[PDB]
Amino acid sequence: SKGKKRSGARPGRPQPLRGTKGKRKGARLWYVGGQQF
Amino acid sequence: SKGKKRSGARPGRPQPLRGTKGKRKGARLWYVGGQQF
């Protein structure tokens, strides 16, 4: 084996998932020909 | 490649070889049944 043996339990309540992606933004990904809202 | 690229020239004269072995002694190697000179 190598290197982990950590732990991960947290207290609280399981809040619902909010936003599929996004922790840190880079450059643009999509180009449609203008703004779209 | 890895790690060397050193140099080794020395000045002086090539003195004759003196003793076949010996830089640092460990434990005994030979057992004849006594001392032998």
Add this chain to the structure above:
Amino acid sequence: SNVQTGAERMPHDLSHLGFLAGQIGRLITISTTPVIAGDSFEMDAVGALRLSPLRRGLAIDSTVDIFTFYVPHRHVYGEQWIKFMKDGVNAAPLPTVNTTGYIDHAAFLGTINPDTNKIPKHLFQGYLNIYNNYFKAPWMPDRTEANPNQLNEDDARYGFRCCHLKNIWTAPLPPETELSRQMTTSTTSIDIMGLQAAYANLHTDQERDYFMQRYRDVISSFGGKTSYDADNRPLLVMRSNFWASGYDVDGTDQTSLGQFSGRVQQTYKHSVPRFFVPEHGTMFTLALVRFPPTATKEIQYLNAKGALTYTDIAGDPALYGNLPPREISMKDVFRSGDASKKFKIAEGQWYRYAPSYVSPAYHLLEGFPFIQEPPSGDLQERVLIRHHDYDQCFQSVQLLQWNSQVKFNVTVYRNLPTTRDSIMTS
């Protein structure tokens, strides 16, 4: 016109969601991502773990494991790689493997089954390498299928079966340990110098049976080291463990007043620190859910074997430290055990271990995840977990025995052109 030859290093998002489900005691793939040589990998995973609704309330916690592994493409394709990378563009494409034609097959690899019934070879073979190096018992045979469509159901829909938590009967000595060894002598004589040399041959054999079934173990005993490239094994990057808890709900109508139902829900986090990727490969993330191995019909060894002798009861140091291992049966630790099933234990192990006690009033009662009958079959069948042993503990739902919803916060530092550079000619 303008021809681009290089790029700058920037972070890339690569974050997504996780609607997972699985069985108990089976190892299933949770997430997967490809990487390039020279990258840096980071991941935070935050989610909730739930079990199916219980029948009578919370009594015993379960333990959950999350692993992350790194598997180079050279460990899978071997010599077809390297030639592929040295030829550059216009090289022959890499091969695939066949799958059974359903939607839920190839779900132990964390993907939906394509309509062509073909997947990249490195996805299937990278799962086998992890299982054969870390999750099966070292004395078991390896698993070598070459095609996911050679597996059966419950191996394609869910992962491979894993091992119980260590115990008196779930962790016996390997079935190849010798209880005696002969030395050839003469009719009325014996060479006492050759007897000394016979003990040194037995010492090396016993080490290779208890500690050193794998090559990386043999080298470690000399004081050496092996890289995972020398052994061709995956690299473990992170491991997490926790216990799952919850609360109860009370019934309030005429019939269910006095009845309770347990709800397991746990918040967890799996964090991987920054990892330098040396070659092209894949990162795997896997999960495993287990219960402590409690059975309703287990007895203490001294209470089950018939008549107590001096060796059983005295606890004499000169006797336990100098005797060979003892062979017993399933009848000595279980009420309805089979006398023809044998396994070996160490002498005096009954003074080092204590089993759990379950009252006879608990026998055949819903809820309460126990093992109702002593396991049957050969040794390999007993050590691995059967998830049908927990069918009476949960209510029937479409989401199997546990489910999870997780967000993966990944971040990679690559050397790639922007989307703008890829679509503009000049």
Add this chain to the structure above:
Amino acid sequence: SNVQTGAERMPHDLSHLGFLAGQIGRLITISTTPVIAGDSFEMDAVGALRLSPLRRGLAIDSTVDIFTFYVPHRHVYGEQWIKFMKDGVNAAPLPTVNTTGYIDHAAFLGTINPDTNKIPKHLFQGYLNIYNNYFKAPWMPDRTEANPNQLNEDDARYGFRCCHLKNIWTAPLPPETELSRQMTTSTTSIDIMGLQAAYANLHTDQERDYFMQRYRDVISSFGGKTSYDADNRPLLVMRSNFWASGYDVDGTDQTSLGQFSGRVQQTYKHSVPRFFVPEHGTMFTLALVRFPPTATKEIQYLNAKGALTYTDIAGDPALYGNLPPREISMKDVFRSGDASKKFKIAEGQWYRYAPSYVSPAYHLLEGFPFIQEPPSGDLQERVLIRHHDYDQCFQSVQLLQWNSQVKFNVTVYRNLPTTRDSIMTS
């Protein structure tokens, strides 16, 4: 009785002497030692390097190289190892190779030929791996013999031929570089977006021809790393280089009054710092002696090609930086060169390099190690050194073209029982 299971860590002497000899431009093995997993290796080598007595005195120094490499046994035996180590005692013995029956054959491996004409396979195969990874030109074919008795004389008595120091004609571009590349178009049209994609395919091909002939080079360009286990290559531990000098002796009789003779003798040291041995293997030490590649009939390129054009003489930056490589012949740099032998150079390379000048009065004169005639044959024959080119420089002796006498001060820290423990039963 008493059975020993372990030992303590102590230093071991392992020092010996060195009476060596060899030819010029050939790589020969100087020392060899086996190691165990978990050891620590150290070495100081102190000696003197001599050439054969010269014919007229000292004019040009030579340069000498000392290398040390570490070769694991798993790189040689492969899968027959590992199985050998996992089985322990009572495993099948490792194979050997055959040699020609003489005393001086197998002398490039640093050993005397046994009377059985058989040597361990790891000695011969470990020499081939060093040569194929570090000493041949990357565009040459590998050498694969499987038996030392398939070599010829001068390959068995002395090492393999190595490459000249880099030069205009000893370091040309690889013989596979393309001077043009076509793109398919229509009759009266051309796709200008596909033209942009044709330049990107050519860029990857040119990189794989000038820098990246080996797999470890391709991975390095992405920014990654490969261990020597992934590539199955030897590990270089130390390298030393120096120039060899001496003095002259004057003749004092009636005929030799006014005559001188050169004597090369140099003191050197090769030091290897402490090295942790991770697996069983061998340490090799090798030597190589060379001269700068000076020839008596070499001319400057601009003085030899006929009529000077603007591209030859102007040194214009817009022209040298945008043209394909130029193909020339041996007649353009040598007086008696062959017009049918071609090689490729970079444009403007005549303004970056200057050759050495040897006066015509020096042609065909003893002493003075030069190359008297332009080399013949294909490209591989020219790049490698021919030691018959230095026969007229030395006087005939039994000790070849150079000889050395060296003491190796080795020290290893092992885990072994003493000699006393091995001979006493109790």
Add this chain to the structure above:
Amino acid sequence: SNVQTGAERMPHDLSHLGFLAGQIGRLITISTTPVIAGDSFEMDAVGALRLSP
């Protein structure tokens, strides 16, 4: 594609050896090198001169 129109200024080695010979009272050429407009030239020559015994 990319077309280069200029360069930067860098030093170039252009060093070599000298095995020379001659007679007495005669002027002979020892070394030669081509140069381009705008260059800077420098030279150190170190050697030994011998006569016949």
